[PDB]
A paper describes a structure:
In this study, we screened bat MHC I Ptal-N*01:01–binding peptides from different bat-borne viruses (HeV, EBOV, MERS-CoV, and H17N10) and determined the structures of bat MHC class I complexed with these viral peptides. The overall structures of Ptal-N*01:01 display the common characteristics of classical MHC I molecules in other mammals, with the extracellular region of the heavy chain folding into three different domains.
However, the other three residues (P1-Asp, P2-Phe, and PΩ-Pro) with electron densities available adopt similar conformations as in the other five structurally determined peptides. As a 9-mer peptide, MERS-CoV-S3 possesses a Glu at P6, corresponding to the P6-Asn in 9-mer HeV2, which is the secondary anchor residue. Detailed analysis indicated that Asp59, Arg65, and the P1-Asp of the peptides in all six structures of Ptal-N*01:01 form a triangular network of hydrogen bonds.
Residue numbers in the entry:
A (entry chain A): 1 to 277
B (entry chain B): 1 to 99
């Protein structure tokens, strides 16, 4: 099995409505644990996971060390917004966004498996750390500029060192302190509901509730015949309590409900479920 | 590069009238990030509404969860109003306790 520590940064200009905003969040696997919002008065990184309450006693400096980093990041991307817009010569009247998504995947070995550091600008790929952790892939002419300054500043090496040490070390700490939340696999609570459309057509909806992690598969089968294109599948969605929900529905004729089955697979399930109305 | 929000209005727990629940409005897949999201009880905005911290998906599109503590009745209508740069008109999506 594998796990991942990630950091999501969002920075965007607000022409007219004040200075640019910077929001960063961090995740382990599929659950946030920290946040930072530049629009706070004296903004500090904050815990967003109960297991983070005991982080100070392993290392109190955590919150100051983090807050300093978040504040500096905040400044770096404010300046970045201006240079990137400059590269493109875009009017200052338009809002623009710089993103960031860096972290590490570690495996049963407790050693890295993939590091990554990637940037988007106005929601499209801009520049990313190559898998060798030493070169950069620039998406356009304006991103060559970013690459060259980053090449010359030695930022790839700064990244590699972080991704291959601190990142791994902390992903392991978090897994340890978050062992209850993070090392669980809550299987979904499944059931089927039944909503008549007319007197000759009826909607079957198959529900998966309260599950974690996000990854799940739901399918309908008509006499063992998969029904994927005939069915409506909603995007997986959080319940607000640290778990997820999903359903699949399909319309069946008003007397042939008995001939359909819902199939559910998830890490928490000892075997995949088959449900029938 | 711009993207229109997707919307799902739903509850944390299956709607048992007169029991306390949470009313969720989950907007995903949008870009840029500035979004206007409100929970409505019978066409009137609900004041005490909270939301999760801004993150985004593999394709860089953002997602947020908006939620408020509520107690469904047989008769009360609930909805989610969403505006975005990409929407010329706000999308209002009615709560349905069955999806």
């Amino acid at each position: 099995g594998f796990h991942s520590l990630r950091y999501f940064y969002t920075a965007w200009s607000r022409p007219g409505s004040g200075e640019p905003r910077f929001v960063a969040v961090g995740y382990v696997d599929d659950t946030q644990f920290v946040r930072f919002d530049s629009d706070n008065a004296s903004p500090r990184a904050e815990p967003r996971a109960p297991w983070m309450d005991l982080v100070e006693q392993q290392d109190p400096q955590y919150w100051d060390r983090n807050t300093r980093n978040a504040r500096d990041a905040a400044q770096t991307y404010r300046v970045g917004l201006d240079n990137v817009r400059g590269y493109y010569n875009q009017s200052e009247a338009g809002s623009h966004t710089i993103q960031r998504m860096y972290g590490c995947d570690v495996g049963p070995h407790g050693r890295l498996l993939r590091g990554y550091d990637q940037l988007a600008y106005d929601g499209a790929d801009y520049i990313a750390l190559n898998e060798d952790l030493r070169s950069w892939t620039a998406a356009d002419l304006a991103a060559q500029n970013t690459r060259r300054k980053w090449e010359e500043a030695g930022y790839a090496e700064r990244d590699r060192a972080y991704l291959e040490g601190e990142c791994v070390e902390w992903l392991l700490k978090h897994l340890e302190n978050g062992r209850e939340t993070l090392l669980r696999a809550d299987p979904p609570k499944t059931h089927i509901t039944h909503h008549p459309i007319s007197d000759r057509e009826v909607t079957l909806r198959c529900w998966a509730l309260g599950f974690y992690p996000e990854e799940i598969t739901l399918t309908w089968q008509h006499d063992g015949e998969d029904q994927t294109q005939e069915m409506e599948l909603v995007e997986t969605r959080p319940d607000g309590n640290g778990a997820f929900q999903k359903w699949a529905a399909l319309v069946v004729p008003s007397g042939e409900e008995q001939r359909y089955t819902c199939h559910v697979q998830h890490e928490g399930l000892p075997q995949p479920l088959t449900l029938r109305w | 590069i711009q993207r229109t929000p997707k919307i799902q209005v739903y509850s944390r727990h299956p709607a048992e009238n007169g029991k306390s629940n949470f009313l969720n409005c989950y907007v995903s897949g949008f870009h840029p990030s500035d979004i206007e999201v409100d929970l409505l009880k019978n066409g009137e905005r609900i004041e005490k509404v909270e939301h999760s911290d801004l993150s985004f998906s593999k394709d860089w599109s953002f997602y947020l969860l908006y939620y408020t503590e509520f107690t469904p009745t047989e008769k009360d209508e609930y909805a989610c109003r969403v505006n975005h740069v990409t929407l010329s008109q706000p999308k209002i999506v009615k709560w349905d306790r069955d999806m």
